[PDB]
């Protein structure tokens, strides 16, 4: 912590007060900084599900390469994860080990969907807006940031009517019709 001299750094090399090997390079912290994750245990709650997908993918690739059970369940899991939005392509089954990843499950969260739909300028702005209760999917208002938005369910991410944000974008283009409140 004091920038050890040469004899000290030679004499105690494995000493590190910040980065440990159980930390795994602080990647929970790293991807929760990237996608602005509030609570500490969401990374590991997603890591359990990525481990489920990859455990099944291992145990399913250990079946013989031609039997219809392996082919049906590999294709069925691939279709389910593409439809949910974690996987970005349902083509190859090496996605079920390589491209299945806590960052993919985190890119499917509601503020990241928002920021990619240009509905907020950054992920922290999207977090603030859906905490303030501006965003509804479908009819019903969504209030928490961790909400996972599937591919067919991202067509209905809008703002609530009577939103001040909806009002100011309509009045920026002065398409505001005050009959329907905005």
């Amino acid at each position: 912590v004091r920038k050890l001299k040469h004899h000290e750094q030679k004499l105690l090399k494995k000493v590190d007060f910040l980065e440990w090997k159980q930390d795994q390079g602080h990647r929970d912290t790293q991807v929760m900084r990237t996608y602005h994750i509030q609570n500490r245990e969401d990374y590991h709650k997603y890591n359990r599900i990525c481990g489920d997908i990859r455990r099944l993918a291992n145990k399913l690739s250990l079946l013989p390469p031609t039997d219809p059970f392996r082919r049906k369940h590999e294709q069925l899991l691939l279709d389910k994860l593409y439809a949910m939005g974690v996987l970005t392509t349902k083509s190859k089954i090496s996605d079920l080990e390589n491209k299945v990843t806590v960052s993919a499950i985190c890119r499917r969260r509601l503020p990241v969907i928002m920021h990619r739909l240009k509905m907020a300028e950054t992920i922290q702005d999207a977090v603030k807006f859906i905490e303030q209760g501006h965003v509804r999917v479908g009819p019903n208002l969504i209030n928490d940031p961790a909400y996972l938005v599937t591919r067919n369910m991202e067509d209905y991410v809008t703002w609530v009517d009577n939103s001040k944000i909806k009002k100011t974008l309509l009045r920026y283009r002065n398409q505001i019709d005050d009959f329907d409140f905005s």
Partner: protein, 282 residues
């Protein structure tokens, strides 16, 4: 469904770009597949990459109609609108009557004051599959455009030797049974593309004794379309000619609906190039 169809076309062309980008891994995985099959040594490029083989453990369980028509090929019958250009002449209205009698599951729509954007939107949310827009020149019909609607392709043809069933004689009424099809020498990949376009606007699975047939016979990029009824005699098979005959020539085939003309062109007729008249399905 505006946003759903826009993002669905977006995801489809993303997946298609990703396929043509990572289609090298398909064929080099094929190389190491046949290297396992017959025990022959593997090249240096496929021998020193360790990640591809430990993906090949997963990928050893991998393995006609094309991407726009593949989802609902024989599952569901088509639904076709036939409409004219705008303020049509009476011989074009007779021809649009004849084309709506050609295709089963086709109706005809009066055209006037219909903008093509909101016409396309009304069709593709009322659930129709194909739109046939017919263009004339002083009675003589000169073009037909077929647009497959869930962001599918448009094939634009010109029509050349048009003789009409209304023009010939009172030879009777048509048949309107689900016909049999004949496609003669559609040999290139553009030929199979045009076949799939022209034949996914007929009902799947006619009767085996369905007594009317309609032929699309390619003769040097000039698809002769005739329609015949038949009755099989003791010595041959007797063909009578019924309904219109023409020659359609594909000059354009692009990959969106009718409204934009910002769609990517799959094929269009290069007319003024130096080697234009030297090849077919050019």
């Amino acid at each position: 469904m505006l946003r759903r169809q826009a993002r669905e076309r977006r995801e489809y062309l993303y997946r298609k770009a990703q396929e043509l980008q990572d289609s090298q891994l398909q064929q080099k995985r094929q190389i190491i597949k046949q290297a396992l099959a017959q025990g022959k040594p593997l090249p240096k490029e496929l021998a020193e990459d360790e990640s591809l083989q430990k993906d090949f453990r997963y990928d050893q369980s991998l393995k006609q109609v094309d991407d726009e028509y593949a989802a609902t090929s024989g599952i569901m019958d088509p639904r076709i609108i036939v409409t004219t250009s705008r303020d049509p002449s009476t011989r074009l209205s007779q021809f649009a009557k004849e084309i709506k009698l050609l295709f089963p599951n086709a109706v005809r729509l009066n055209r006037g004051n219909y903008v093509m954007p909101n016409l396309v939107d009304a069709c593709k949310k009322s659930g129709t599959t194909d739109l046939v827009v017919l263009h004339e020149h002083r009675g003589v019909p000169t073009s037909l455009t077929i647009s497959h609607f869930p962001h599918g392709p448009t094939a634009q043809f010109s029509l050349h030797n048009v003789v009409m069933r209304h023009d010939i004689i009172n030879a009777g009424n048509q048949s309107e049974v689900n016909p049999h099809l004949i496609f003669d020498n559609f040999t290139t990949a553009l030929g199979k593309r045009v076949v799939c376009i022209l034949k996914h606007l007929f009902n799947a699975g006619p009767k085996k004794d369905s007594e009317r047939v309609i032929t699309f016979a390619n003769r040097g990029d000039f698809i002769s379309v005739r329609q015949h009824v038949y009755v099989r005699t003791r010595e041959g098979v007797e063909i009578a000619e019924v309904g219109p005959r023409f020659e359609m020539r594909l000059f354009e085939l692009r990959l969106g609906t009718l409204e934009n003309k910002d769609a990517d062109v799959e094929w269009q007729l290069r007319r003024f190039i130096r080697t234009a008249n030297k090849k077919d399905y050019l």
